[PDB]
């Protein structure tokens, strides 16, 4: 009858959809609830299973950069029971994934403020470096090792095209694909690869990301004037 | 010998600032015990802020 009986259901769901959030950074949603994020604290508490994760999120309550030292094992049991609780298909969820949720929270208790906040902390301050460097220089010393790399398959690459006739098949096919309202639903597919180009590196990430990746959509603009000299 | 504690605390941190984990509170009281006891002034709040 206690005061934690009232809906571990709701609580589950609710943390999950919030760790999902945060971690894959699946889906758009009005994801907020303070008192969630407690019942989240709290459902943990009622686990000996997740202690570790709480004990590691609380480190964070002082605020300060740090990265705790790992401890092999417990890290092991720490990312199993990770994965348990997200209780994705062995989606080999990583510790870079772990740290960044981490220090989701150290980002988030920042604020006392209580209005709304707009803010995407994209950056993370912790990554484990002492100062970001340049993309350039990142560029030369990679491409360095590239071109040493030996291919690794033979194309044939002699004259080939592969095409397919079987017309009432494709319609067929077309038929079983049309109720999709694909319209609305790829935005979700764009906004997978732009997560991805942040998801590219946690090492001296890309400081500016925004206005020639606005430049790409513009294209759409360069696209018009050519359609209309 | 009466330090090596806090030594060994020092040896860790002689590493790029890894998080000092939490102690138990004999531990804490026996570090700030040995802390005051190695500077003599109590005339000052002296605490775990200094330690950090």
């Known amino acids: 009858p206690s005061e934690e009986l009232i809906n571990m ?12 959030h945060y971690s894959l950074n699946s889906t758009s949603s009005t994801e907020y609830k303070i008192s969630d994020v407690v019942m989240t604290m709290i459902f943990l508490l009622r686990s000996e299973k997740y202690h570790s994760l709480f004990k590691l999120l609380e480190t964070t309550f002082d605020d300060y950069t740090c990265r705790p030292q790992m401890t092999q094992v417990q890290t092991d049991t720490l990312l199993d029971a990770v994965r348990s609780l997200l209780e994705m298909p062995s989606t ?3 510790l870079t994934t772990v740290d960044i949720m981490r220090s989701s929270f150290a980002r988030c208790f920042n604020s006392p403020i209580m209005r709304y906040a707009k803010i995407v902390l994209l950056q993370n301050v912790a990554l484990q470096r002492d100062k970001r460097t340049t993309l350039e220089e990142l560029l030369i010393e990679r491409g360095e090792k ?29 038929k079983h694909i049309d109720p999709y309202p694909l319209s609305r639903m790829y935005y979700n597919a764009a906004n997978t690869m732009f997560y991805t180009t942040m998801e590219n590196y946690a090492v001296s990430n890309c400081k500016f990301n925004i206005e020639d990746y606005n430049n790409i959509f513009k ?11």
């Open 219 to 229: 294209v759409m603009e360069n696209i018009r004037k050519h359609s209309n000299k």
């Open 9 to 20: 259901r709701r609580y589950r769901n609710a943390a999950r959809k919030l760790i999902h």
């Open 92 to 94: 080999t969820i990583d």
């Open 146 to 174: 590239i071109q040493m790399l030996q291919p690794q398959q033979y194309i044939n690459s002699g004259t080939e095209i592969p095409f397919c006739d079987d017309a009432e098949f494709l319609n067929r096919l077309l």
